[PDB]
Write an enzyme that holds these catalytic residues in place. Structure first.
Site, mmCIF file in Angstrom:
data_model
loop_
_atom_site.group_PDB
_atom_site.id
_atom_site.type_symbol
_atom_site.label_atom_id
_atom_site.label_comp_id
_atom_site.label_asym_id
_atom_site.label_seq_id
_atom_site.Cartn_x
_atom_site.Cartn_y
_atom_site.Cartn_z
ATOM 1 N N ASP A 81 0.812 -1.209 0.000
ATOM 2 C CA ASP A 81 0.000 0.000 0.000
ATOM 3 C C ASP A 81 0.858 1.277 0.000
ATOM 4 O O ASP A 81 0.335 2.391 0.069
ATOM 5 C CB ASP A 81 -0.970 -0.002 1.195
ATOM 6 C CG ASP A 81 -0.273 0.113 2.550
ATOM 7 O OD1 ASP A 81 0.909 0.487 2.606
ATOM 8 O OD2 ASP A 81 -0.919 -0.156 3.584
ATOM 9 N N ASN B 173 5.294 0.634 11.303
ATOM 10 C CA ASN B 173 4.619 0.990 10.053
ATOM 11 C C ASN B 173 4.212 2.480 9.973
ATOM 12 O O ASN B 173 3.546 3.003 10.885
ATOM 13 C CB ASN B 173 3.369 0.109 9.890
ATOM 14 C CG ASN B 173 2.820 0.119 8.472
ATOM 15 O OD1 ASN B 173 3.440 0.653 7.550
ATOM 16 N ND2 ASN B 173 1.648 -0.471 8.293
#
Ligand SMILES: [Cl-]
Ligand code: NA
Length: 129
Positions: free
Chosen positions: A48, A59
């Site tokens: 993504d 992340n």
């Protein structure tokens, strides 16, 4: 910095991770082993377009700002690059916030797939703590 196993265990203990939220030290070291191979400079790109950073592969989709993940959150309120320092403090503080958000260490895929339900104490055997 590429940590030694016992070196990282000790740095982790000193920063309050032993039994944090009920997760013994062996868990954190095991996760770090398989997330980053004990390397603070590890980065991995996700499909993504978010990126995982550092010793615990945190992340940018939710946790840090890297200026290149449109629509993402910065819940630990840090630049993602601070997660790559040889000082694991920032990674540890952000990890504490992650582990506490309801899902525990299941947030770390490699922990879920390679540490959960194993003898994680083995990861700290022999170390002086
Ligand atoms: Cl939990
Ligand atoms: Na972000």
């Amino acid at each position: 910095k590429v940590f030694g196993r016992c070196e990282l265990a000790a740095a982790m203990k000193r920063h309050g991770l032993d039994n944090y939220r009920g997760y013994s030290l062996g868990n954190w070291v095991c996760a770090a082993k398989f997330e980053s191979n004990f390397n603070t400079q590890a980065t991995n790109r996700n499909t993504d377009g978010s990126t995982d950073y550092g010793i615990l592969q945190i992340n940018s989709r939710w946790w840090c700002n890297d200026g290149r993940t449109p629509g993402s959150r910065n819940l630990c309120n840090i630049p993602c690059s601070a997660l790559l320092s040889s000082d694991i403090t920032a990674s540890v503080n952000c990890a504490k916030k992650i582990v506490s958000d309801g899902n525990g260490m299941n947030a770390w895929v490699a922990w879920r797939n390679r540490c959960k339900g194993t003898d994680v104490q083995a990861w700290i055997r022999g170390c002086r703590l």
